[PDB]
Amino acid sequence: ICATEILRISLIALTRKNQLISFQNGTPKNVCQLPFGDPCAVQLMDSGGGNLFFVVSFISNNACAVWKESFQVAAKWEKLSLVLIDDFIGSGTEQVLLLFKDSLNSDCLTSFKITDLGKINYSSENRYLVVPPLETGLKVCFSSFRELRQHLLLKEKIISKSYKALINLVQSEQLVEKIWYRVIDDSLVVGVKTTSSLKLSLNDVTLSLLMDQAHDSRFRLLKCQNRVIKLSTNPFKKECVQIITAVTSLSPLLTFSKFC
Amino acid sequence: APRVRYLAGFCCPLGGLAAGKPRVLCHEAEVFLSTGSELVYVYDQEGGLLTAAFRFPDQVWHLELLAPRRLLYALCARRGLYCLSLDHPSPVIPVDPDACILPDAALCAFTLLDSVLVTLVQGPARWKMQLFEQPCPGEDPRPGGQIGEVELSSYTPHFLPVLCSVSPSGSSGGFTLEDALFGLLFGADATLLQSPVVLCGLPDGQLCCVILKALVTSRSAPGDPNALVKILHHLEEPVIFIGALKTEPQEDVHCDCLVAFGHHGRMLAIKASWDESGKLVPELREYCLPGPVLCAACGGGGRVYHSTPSDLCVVDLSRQPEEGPGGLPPMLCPASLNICSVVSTKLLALSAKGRLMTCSLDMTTESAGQKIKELLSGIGNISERVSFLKKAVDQRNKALTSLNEAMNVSCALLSSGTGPRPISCTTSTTWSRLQTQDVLMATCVLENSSSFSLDQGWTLCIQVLTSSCALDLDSACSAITYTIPVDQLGPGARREVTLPLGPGENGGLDLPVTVSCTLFYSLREVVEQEGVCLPLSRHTVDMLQCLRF
Amino acid sequence: MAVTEASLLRQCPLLLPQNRSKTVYEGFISAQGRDFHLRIVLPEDLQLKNARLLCSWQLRTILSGYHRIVQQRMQHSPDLMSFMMELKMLLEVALKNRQELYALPPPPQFYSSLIEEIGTLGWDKLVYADTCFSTIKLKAEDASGREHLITLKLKAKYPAESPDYFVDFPVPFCASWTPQSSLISIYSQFLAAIESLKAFWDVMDEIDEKTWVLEPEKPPRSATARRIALGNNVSINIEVDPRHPTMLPECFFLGADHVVKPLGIKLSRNIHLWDPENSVLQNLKDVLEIDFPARAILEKSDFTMDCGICYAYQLDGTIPDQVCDNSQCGQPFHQICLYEWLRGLLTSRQSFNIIFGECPYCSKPITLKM
Amino acid sequence: PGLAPPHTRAPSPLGPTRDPVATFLETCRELPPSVASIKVSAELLRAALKDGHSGVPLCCATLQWLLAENAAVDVVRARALSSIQGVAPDGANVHLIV
Amino acid sequence: EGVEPAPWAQLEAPARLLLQALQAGPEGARRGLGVLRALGSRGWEPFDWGRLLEALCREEPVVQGPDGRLELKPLLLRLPRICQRNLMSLLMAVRPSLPESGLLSVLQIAQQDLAPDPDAWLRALGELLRRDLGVGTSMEGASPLSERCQRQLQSLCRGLGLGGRRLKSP
Ligand SMILES: [Zn+2]
Ligand SMILES: [Zn+2]
């Protein structure tokens, strides 16, 4: 588990099929896939601003690190006596420490490697003129990363802004209470319950259904027959109930097990 | 050598410690710490072992300290306000209720000046500032009797308020300002009385000043709020920090700047100008930093160390006056909330995990080869992430392009041009044959004349509404509706749909029947309820189109 | 397209109209693979004489030095579309000018491959590399035992395009660059040019050894002229052809009109005796029928005592009198030359009969009293 | 569709990329042109196509006879085309030469 | 308000001095040579032609012609016309010690391809530099002179008895 709100838990998992899956209140977002098999554990690593990893350890003495923000194996390691996650250096950002097998020596803390997966990498003919260039290159690369993230945030902000702009471009009292749907045999029945404001004497209303084209790769015209339903509530003022309903076939829509 | 040392660790929930409440203090070499729990800890900073721990009841919400009297005031949440002698005649120690002073059991905030105490207490709608004596002679630690109260009538209600004391030069855990800024903000009364002032920042985001000398009241002389409490600035968002800085640094520092900070990152800075008309004016700047700010502090020379959920960052106001934009380098330490800054630069913090730590800012043969190897590995590691983010950016650009095409189509479709150019939909009736009975079908041809391509995200919505005029008996079909996705239509292209209108039951067709097309754009599909419809044509089928000779 | 309905899409795709009436545009503008934030509010009508245009501080700092031009273009420009075209053009110019501050190479090809190639060379060669890794400089040796340098300047794509090569030696250096070639290739070309130009170097080194060379001092390797001194208060300048150094040079004489005439005469009479199998000195000595002095004065060789504007002594009776109040310049001038120079510069200010300004050579305060 | 009478912009059919039950199964669980030809004697085809209606003696009348039941035979009668590229019922293309 | 800075304000000081010297009439080129010997004499014995020939192609904006027209000019066309002519004369003088990559970018400007109101002197010194590199034979009638002058000179030489030499080789 990762976080909790009010009950809503955000949660990493992993499975027998060598997966690594996310969940945000029962919402399997952002699946991954892992190279090695028989996984034991995951720990988490922070590494700096936003650079969350998940370090995954396996039964077969090996481990992987997957980079959140792109559920993608950023690194793999082998033979791994141990994996530890902490600040061994003194920088104030987590590292990962990897211990390599005792075949080398009859001692534990030799044959190590410490790696933030970035600027920090430690392990167990002038050439000095080249160095400050490379250090400046590392710092420029890191700065470009830190700048791209912010640029990307800004693009998402602008896209949101312009969605809302469209919505106000075409255009308060709730014309509709709420929606409900049932399945009878091979029909979907979707219905919506109106309010006082919507006067079916004065207004022809319909109720269309629209398939998400993400599911609908094809030109299936989807058809819907509409009824209105007035029922009087304890007539034996007195409340009427108008509701509006649409009926369609199901089996054209469960090709991908699912639809929205 | 190691710029960050870890001194001890504490209990973190999932995620980490919440903000507002955790507090770090330093006297000389002791450090006093609350994590928003029932405990307050004392660490000797030489070897970071805990000398002592103090179990309060109910969530310590604030701490303050007197060095000369060797006392420590603390605020339990729904109980009141405790005082503890650090001499204090297992290392855990429960606090006895003898130490409670003014058990107001509703006080949300407090501060301290030389011989005076200031609280701030919640009630119903109007919150109220009070002011108490605090006995100068070393005696039984008592409050004394309240000198004064007020009611912050401006405030009508997670985020506690904050108080800050501001004294001028000539007249204490607060800030000493300079005479120019003091007179600019608080006026002549305060400047002549040499009166300390109290700044209360509230969760509304208002930042109110109170002069203390003016706050002397009784049951025969009630405090007038509109006279006595005044309002500097209204940040839209809650307040985290108030401070002051010696910009132009060129213990008792005579500050020149007044700093405030919002949860969401509205910084505010005020300075003295005396510019452009021969008159003293204030230079405000409402900056807008990134992040939800969690904590802040103030260090030597116009620097303001703050923290985000990402990283511990820093801002400099030192140099028109102070600064146009605020640019803020991280210091490559994690999200420390609860930061304190002592000057000698050596700051203290509580990591949002739960760690206490002391951030201390400030050739070879073939090891140079290993160094080159490490540097190349580093650049190769980062580049493979920069790549991914570039591709993400390409896709967000693609989203923006599609949306732009959408808005252009929409504006053309909503506009009047005297010819329905951009997208049209004609219908046309045709009688056909199914098994024995002739049927009446409608072909709805959609045509793109203009350049605009209807790429993925658009869908036709046709609706055939039978006879109208709502009856005694709600019918079995008031309308049929069809939807089809439009994909890769483009310019000059044409789509065609035939629909039945004609008698399936009873051999009876009622006229006029109106067939109406529309287009729906979905914001989601390329990546309150969100979509837009646009109104293409509307054909009525009447008898004359349905006759057959 | 012609109308601003599809031409605007095609030429600024990431500008999204917020409002229905296309009056508020917001979004990003592209220039040299870089997107800049931008919000451009029009009035209720389509007029740019008054409009708002806000930017990110990145874009403002990048449009430093053109604010007046953009403000003028807002008032002068008919349409928004053309204003955006002009703004993209202007951004491209600003970036291509300040290419120092704004760049990022592709490391997976670049940073590793350059070190691989320098290792292929050998690390005894390289002497300098800049912190942006743009400039590098390499060394080579003559068979005679002379050090000669070669500067390269590298782009974001080094192996794709040619790197700019700067070399001292006087003949134009030609380097056949391929995308397959590398630093060893250009270095081999450099050694080829070195072994070719060996002979010219030998001649000029022999002169610099055995003569009181006068007015180049610590000469570069590009220099083909050498004003040699001989006797007293007379000199001979000599320009040499690199391809044919030992061949006769263009040569002539400075000094006293009564001393120089017999030298020109003797040169004319003996010029047929030149032979390009001996040395320049060994030919000059038997042509002019004299020997040279070896640094008759090594300390007070010569200090050019001329106007430092007109490079003449005796301009219309006047002498070089006005000097610099500086140990490192000491450059004389004339009243007239220095007045005409200083009356131009923006720094200079004139009191009643006084002008203060910067010395032309060293840019230090110099005073002229007419 | 190309040789058709109207020469009007019709969308191309492009039959389904998968059967829908096949799509269901794949989702829930996660080149040269082929040719055939015949030959036949010109004498046979002439004597069989006698009553020479119109057009070229061979290949065109042959194609008219091959498509004599198809609705779009009058078009080919006019244009006198010895080759065509039709589609199919299943969306695939088919080109038939004589 | 209407103060204009010198277009060599932002350049390397020695280049600034050179371009200040060449401004000074027909004795501008000799003064350019005196300047270059007076920097062989000083601490920086080499002079960075490769930097000056980039700056000479660098573009900045101007507004000329009507009241309003934005155009981008390089330095060579933005600095004073006598500085231009005495520059190109000095580049004839020190051609051999110049980088060709920069020179060609300069000569392309001097050629003034597709311009109204050209500089005949700049174009002619362009041609005379091309001819001296050996990349501007050009297979054209691209001569320093005008068609007018070349025609009025054919017109006169036609009135003279052609000589027994054979210099053109048919
Ligand atoms: Zn002079
Ligand atoms: Zn000087």
Curated annotation (Swiss-Prot), chain A:
Belongs to the multisubunit FA complex composed of FANCA, FANCB, FANCC, FANCE, FANCF, FANCG, FANCL/PHF9 and FANCM. The complex is not found in FA patients. It is linked to Fanconi anemia complementation group B: A disorder affecting all bone marrow elements and resulting in anemia, leukopenia and thrombopenia. It is associated with cardiac, renal and limb malformations, dermal pigmentary changes, and a predisposition to the development of malignancies. At the cellular level it is associated with hypersensitivity to DNA-damaging agents, chromosomal instability (increased chromosome breakage) and defective DNA repair. Some severe FANCB cases manifest features of VACTERL syndrome with hydrocephalus. The chain holds residues 242 to 594 of 859 of the full protein. Signal peptide: none annotated. This is Fanconi anemia group B protein. It comes from Homo sapiens (Human). It comes from the Eukaryota. The gene is FANCB. It is found in: Nucleus. The lineage of its organism: Eukaryota, Metazoa, Chordata, Craniata, Vertebrata. Transmembrane segments: none annotated. DNA repair protein required for FANCD2 ubiquitination.
From Swiss-Prot, chain C:
The keyword Zinc applies. InterPro entries: Fancl, FANCL_C, FANCL_d2, FANCL_d3, FANCL_d3_sf, FancL_WD-rpt_cont_dom, UBQ-conjugating_enzyme/RWD, Znf_RING/FYVE/PHD. It holds the Pfam family FANCL_d2. Zn(2+) 2 binds at residues 324, 329, 359, 362. It catalyses: S-ubiquitinyl-[E2 ubiquitin-conjugating enzyme]-L-cysteine + [acceptor protein]-L-lysine = [E2 ubiquitin-conjugating enzyme]-L-cysteine + N(6)-ubiquitinyl-[acceptor protein]-L-lysine. The RING-type zinc finger domain is monoubiquitinated in the presence of UBE2T and UBE2W. It is found in: Cytoplasm; Nucleus. Pathway: Protein modification; protein ubiquitination. GO terms for biological process: DNA damage response; DNA repair; gamete generation; interstrand cross-link repair; protein monoubiquitination; regulation of cell population proliferation. It is an enzyme of class 2 (transferase). GO terms for molecular function: ubiquitin protein ligase activity; ubiquitin protein ligase binding; ubiquitin-protein transferase activity; zinc ion binding. The modification N-acetylalanine is found at residue 2. The keyword DNA damage applies. A zinc finger (RING-type) spans 307-363. Interacts with GGN. Belongs to the multisubunit FA complex composed of FANCA, FANCB, FANCC, FANCE, FANCF, FANCG, FANCL/PHF9 and FANCM. The complex is not found in FA patients. In complex with FANCF, FANCA and FANCG, but not with FANCC, nor FANCE, interacts with HES1; this interaction may be essential for the stability and nuclear localization of FA core complex proteins. Interacts with FANCI. Directly interacts (via the RING-type zinc finger) with UBE2T and UBE2W.
From Swiss-Prot, chain D:
It is found in: Nucleus. Disulfide bonds: none annotated. The modification Phosphoserine is found at residue 12. Belongs to the multisubunit FA complex composed of FANCA, FANCB, FANCC, FANCE, FANCF, FANCG, FANCL/PHF9, FANCM, FAAP24 and FAAP100. Forms a subcomplex with FANCB and FANCL. Plays a role in Fanconi anemia-associated DNA damage response network. Regulates FANCD2 monoubiquitination and the stability of the FA core complex. Induces chromosomal instability as well as hypersensitivity to DNA cross-linking agents, when repressed. This is Fanconi anemia core complex-associated protein 100. It comes from Homo sapiens (Human). The chain holds residues 656 to 768 of 881 of the full protein.
Swiss-Prot record, chain E:
Phosphorylated. It is found in: Nucleus. It comes from the Eukaryota. As part of the Fanconi anemia (FA) complex functions in DNA cross-links repair. Required for the nuclear accumulation of FANCC and provides a critical bridge between the FA complex and FANCD2. Belongs to the multisubunit FA complex composed of FANCA, FANCB, FANCC, FANCE, FANCF, FANCG, FANCL/PHF9 and FANCM. The complex is not found in FA patients. Interacts with FANCC and FANCD2. It is linked to Fanconi anemia complementation group E: A disorder affecting all bone marrow elements and resulting in anemia, leukopenia and thrombopenia. It is associated with cardiac, renal and limb malformations, dermal pigmentary changes, and a predisposition to the development of malignancies. At the cellular level it is associated with hypersensitivity to DNA-damaging agents, chromosomal instability (increased chromosome breakage) and defective DNA repair. This is Fanconi anemia group E protein. It comes from Homo sapiens (Human). The gene is FANCE.
